[PDB]
């Protein structure tokens, strides 16, 4: 009775049927109205609206998650509207404020002071089958930097989207924060700070801590357990990724996810441009996490179409803070023989690229002159401003389409409003959202028991996403499927991963399903109340 | 472990000690910080402040009640600030909105459709010893009228103050709403309405329903169980009170509570005026619930000082909507031989009263002319504007003190800011708050097992409250003890009730305590986390 009411996996609030209330001894704990799930959603949505800030909407929906999970996920899937609330950008403001606003803890807090005993910290977690973990140490949260143990908002929001877009069982998800200290002065000063009041442990101590984590997780949950890293600083992010990705089932969404969407965007763009990936010359604003990831994956796509690596790598140039990368580590692989230059406007003139991709978080970088030039060299220039949030974007959709006379093929990381041209035709610039990628990958991988997540599954994931963009959508300027469809996109992504895994004997879940589409559906969470 | 976390009676959040977390298997469910109860309060208070409306503060504190009760009550007792949030006035806005905003149900919903089976509805309630119930049918909520099953906010807020001001164990409190329909057009129209979508059942069906309620309650919980009525319409409020108060342990705070504070105010005022209750002539604006209650209790006080009823009743006049009450039911008892009149200004001229008490909810009724006149007949006129909220008050403290040249002795139902006079002396008009009365009465009654709550215990309660007003306070214009002290006032009230009950053999809790003060303390809730 009343206990059921307090269990968020099984509580229905007013959706408890009049019979159920009588059979479960709760008739009287609730008011007389019965409410279908649809009337329930209407209520939540009305609230959602009447509230003054998105921050308050985040708080509303999180409280709802803590009380009626089915309804939480029902509200979200009813996504374009709510994903920005439950995750990025609003979840950044939540992390900033996590110590002020801390209420009902979700997830696991694992500290360096638990070194040697991590395995026992996991035993505090009430749920015994975990198939998906998201972890952070809170050091690099979006553009807000080091928020330490406040970083917990990030894994919690991310898994919400695993469940909502992908259908991961939320009871099999484990958000985790690793607290090794923080360099955040304000937090260390704050009497309300919930983390360890000390600076970040660095070096060998840190590395062994992480090693014990992966070992503990794989050991309690099995080596099939998916471990996604998120919002670590640049150097740790590559170090840990490359150290672990052939031993554990694991990826870093910030470099690998981002690589998959962007490429999907490119593949999609080739249908408008009607030429091959090998006919492109690609210039990156930025040479960090994302930039290198995307490039690596573009190279793979080039190999797949038939080019060797040497000829393929020559098609891509990068630009860092200190300027263009040329002959004089991972950067070194794209260091072609060329006179050094610094000015972006001049760089695009000498290189004259077919596609221009901004992943350096410097807003405005794609100036009128650069768009002017891109529109001059190319009948239809590809221009990706993928940096977040809107304020740090390399240029607006309006500026992009205005200056290129509507000829630019454009996508961004953060969403822009549809643009109407003088033409009268309205363009709908697509959003390079990592959530086209991670939910479907996680679902596929976990569904067939893949033990390692290779770059190939990110490539084929990009291919599936592009295959889902309709010619109608391309004509509307969309390089990605409408965000309303991600549930189906995710399912398509996961179907492909599973089909290939059985065909390649990489799967580990046996016996093999006779129907892979149904097999994937069988592993997807329903918004419906269990009877 | 995690279950404890979900139990609001025993959850400590960050106050869980580092040992406790390890012994209870929750180390990892919480971030690393330990927080004393005082740091916990600081957090909650910071939140409380940063929020945009009192309505949002109500929502904050209610969520906190649903998650960490000790901390909830700790925050409240840390009262002048928070009582307006958790109860009236803000709880009115909450009731208006209860169907939009409905989250985690508290209390019992008992419907006419449960007639014949009420006893079994009570069995859904998880708590087995209930010593205090507050009930409403939602028909007359403050000045907002009929809010039907949305009325549940009212008992829930009221019991919060029983616990906070009085120390009732919140686990032994039962908020109840009786849903017999509503006459509220908007609600009956509203798809989100949580109540019965029908008009109010009236007459014999209604009366038998209520009869079964009292019978069920007394039967499951014992005849000592305190049953307080609240926010019923006028006619039901007297009907039910008089029908039940010699059979069940029960009172109506709106008529009896109000009577106790007001009288306490009067008794307090006689120390400034330095004359006897028998030297007064009292005029009421209003002749309803409150008015008649107060008058009845003033009469008792007069009898106690030595007057017979006949001579005593002649000292009091009433005024209703249709005018002064004179010779031409309960009203009939004060109908003295006098020419009929309607104009209030003229009424105060012919009657020339020493004390003027407004309990008709008509704001502004005490006009400049009336205050002018009151200040003319009396060196120090007593003027009570007890109607709520501020907007419906018979006059402001500023208007009262300005127009009477600082000579008026003033109290109100709703709080007014301190007034500085030309004198330089600052006056602090007291608030005739029912919460000086109900918490201490409930505590006393329940503590010694009184089976019926007589008018005498309301009279002596008024006496105790006045006895607590210091001569310093009287000089500052306060007719009630500072609202910060109610915990002690309540305790004084309950001590008196208990001492007298044993001296009069009216108590039913035996064996008799040797020390009644300690005995009362023993029955008071602590804000401290149980070890």
From Swiss-Prot, chains A, B:
Keywords: Acetylation, Cytoplasm, Metal-binding, NADP, Oxidoreductase, Phosphoprotein. A divalent metal cation binds at residues 230-231, 254. Its main location: cytoplasm. The keyword ATP-binding does not apply. The keyword Translocase does not apply. Divalent metal cations. Prefers magnesium or manganese. It is found in: Cytoplasm. This is NADP-dependent malic enzyme. It comes from Homo sapiens.
């Amino acid at each position: 009775g009343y206990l059921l009411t307090r269990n968020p996996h099984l509580n229905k609030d007013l959706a408890f049927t009049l019979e159920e209330r009588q059979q479960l001894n709760i008739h009287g704990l609730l008011p007389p109205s019965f409410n279908s799930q649809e009337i329930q959603v209407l209520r939540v949505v009305k609230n959602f609206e009447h509230l003054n800030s998105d921050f308050d909407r985040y708080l509303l929906l999180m409280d709802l998650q803590d009380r009626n999970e089915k309804l939480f996920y029902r509200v979200l899937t009813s996504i374009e509207k709510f994903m920005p609330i439950v995750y990025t950008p609003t979840v950044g403001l939540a992390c900033q404020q996590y110590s002020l606003v801390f209420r009902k803890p979700r997830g696991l807090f694992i500290t360096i002071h638990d070194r040697g005993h991590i395995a026992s910290v996991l035993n505090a977690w009430p749920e015994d089958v975990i198939k998906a973990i998201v972890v952070t140490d809170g050091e690099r949260i979006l553009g807000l930097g080091d928020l330490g143990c406040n970083g917990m908002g990030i894994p919690v929001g991310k898994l919400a989207l695993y469940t909502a877009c992908g259908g991961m069982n939320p009871q099999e998800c484990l958000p985790v924060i690793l607290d090794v200290g923080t360099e955040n002065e304000e937090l260390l000063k704050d009497p309300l700070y919930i983390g360890l009041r000390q600076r970040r442990v660095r070096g060998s101590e840190y590395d062994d801590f992480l090693d014990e984590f992966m070992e503990a997780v794989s050991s309690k949950y099995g080596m099939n357990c998916l471990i996604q890293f998120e919002d670590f600083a640049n150097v740790n992010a590559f170090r840990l990724l490359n150290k672990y990705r052939n031993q554990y089932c694991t990826f870093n969404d910030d470099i690998q996810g981002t690589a998959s969407v962007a490429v999907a965007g490119l593949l999609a763009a080739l249908r408008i441009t009607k030429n091959k990936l090998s006919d492109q010359t690609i210039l990156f604003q930025g040479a960090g996490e994302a930039a290198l990831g995307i490039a690596h994956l573009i190279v793979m796509a080039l190999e797949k179409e038939g080019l060797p690596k040497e000829k393929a790598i020559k098609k891509i140039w990068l630009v860092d803070s200190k300027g263009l990368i040329v002959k004089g580590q991972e950067k070194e692989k794209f260091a072609h023989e060329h006179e050094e230059m610094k000015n972006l406007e001049a760089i695009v003139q000498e290189i004259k690229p077919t596609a221009l991709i901004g992943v350096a978080a410097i807003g405005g970088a794609f100036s009128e002159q650069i768009l002017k030039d891109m529109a001059a060299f190319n009948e239809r220039p590809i221009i990706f401003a993928l940096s977040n949030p809107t304020s740090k974007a390399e240029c607006s959709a309006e500026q992009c389409y205005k200056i290129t006379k509507g000829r630019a093929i454009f996508a961004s990381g953060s969403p822009f409003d549809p643009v109407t041209l003088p033409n009268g035709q309205t363009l709908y610039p697509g959003q390079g959202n990592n959530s086209y990628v991670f939910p479907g990958v996680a679902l596929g991988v976990v569904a067939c028991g893949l033990r390692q997540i290779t770059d190939n599954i990110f490539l084929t994931t990009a291919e599936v996403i592009a295959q889902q963009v309709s010619d109608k959508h391309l004509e509307e300027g969309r390089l990605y499927p409408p965000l309303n469809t991600i549930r189906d996109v995710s399912l398509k992504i996961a179907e492909k991963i599973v089909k290939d895994a059985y065909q390649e004997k990489t799967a580990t879940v046996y016996p093999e399903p006779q129907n892979k589409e149904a097999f994937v559906r069988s592993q997807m969470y329903s918004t419906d109340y269990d009877q």
